[PDB]
RNA sequence: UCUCAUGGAGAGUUCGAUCCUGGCUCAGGAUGAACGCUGGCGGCAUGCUUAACACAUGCAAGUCGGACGGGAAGUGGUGUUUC
């Protein structure tokens, strides 16, 4: 999924030589996403390699029986900060651009996110995925702590 | 994987490009609203925010004759009953 095209500009004697950037995403809508970054001449290029770049880095969105999230979670990017929290069953993804289509690639089906902070498209995808990479799930903190399950819960 | 949560969206704009700080601007709701165009019906509401500025006309607080003396309408007369 491309996110965003840009064209950024190298500057050399003869004039203005022009490349295009890509911000693109990549998941299964199973719960498997990754992003990559691109840059090429032409667009189509551009994305490609933006597509074997998320490949190569790709990570797992831990998810809860409804499809969200175990828990509530901040992250920081450089200036993108971002907070997703869990969401009922039946409210859908709420976010902005990068957190919003990363999330949805993800397959995550209910959740809120906000981006604070900052607005650049990828330092906001970034932050969601370590995010989304910090998230404990249940089995993993009772597996840690010590502690059964039905403790926890409680 | 019980319980809680029924909730927080961004976008353009400084640069040859980038990241940031930072303002402006937009998308939503709400009116005791006004104006423009257009306008079939019904249901329930609403209607001088300004000059506590002036007011023509008409009506918005009376009733009791079982407190009381009278007179005025009739009636034949203080037997009747009204004002
Ligand atoms: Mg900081
Ligand atoms: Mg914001
Ligand atoms: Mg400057
Ligand atoms: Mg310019
Ligand atoms: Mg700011
Ligand atoms: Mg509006
Ligand atoms: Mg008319
Ligand atoms: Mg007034
Ligand atoms: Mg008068
Ligand atoms: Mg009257
Ligand atoms: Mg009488
Ligand atoms: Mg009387
Ligand atoms: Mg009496
Ligand atoms: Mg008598």
Known sequence: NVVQVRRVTKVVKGGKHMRFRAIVVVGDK??????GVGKAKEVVSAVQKAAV?????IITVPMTK?????????A????????????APGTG?????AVRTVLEMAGVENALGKQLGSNNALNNA?????????MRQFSD????R????????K
């Open 93 to 97: 993804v709420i976010a902005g651009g």
């Open 66 to 74: 409804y499809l969200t999230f175990p828990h509530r979670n901040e």
């Open 126 to 134: 970034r932050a969601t995925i370590v995010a989304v990479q910090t």
């Open 30 to 35: 199973k719960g498997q996403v990754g992003v």
């Open 146 to 153: 010590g502690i059964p399950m039905e403790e926890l819960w």
């Open 76 to 87: 920081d990017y450089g200036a993108a900060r971002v907070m997703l929290r869990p969401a």
């Open 141 to 144: 903190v009772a597996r840690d």
């Open 53 to 57: 770049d998320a490949r190569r880095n």
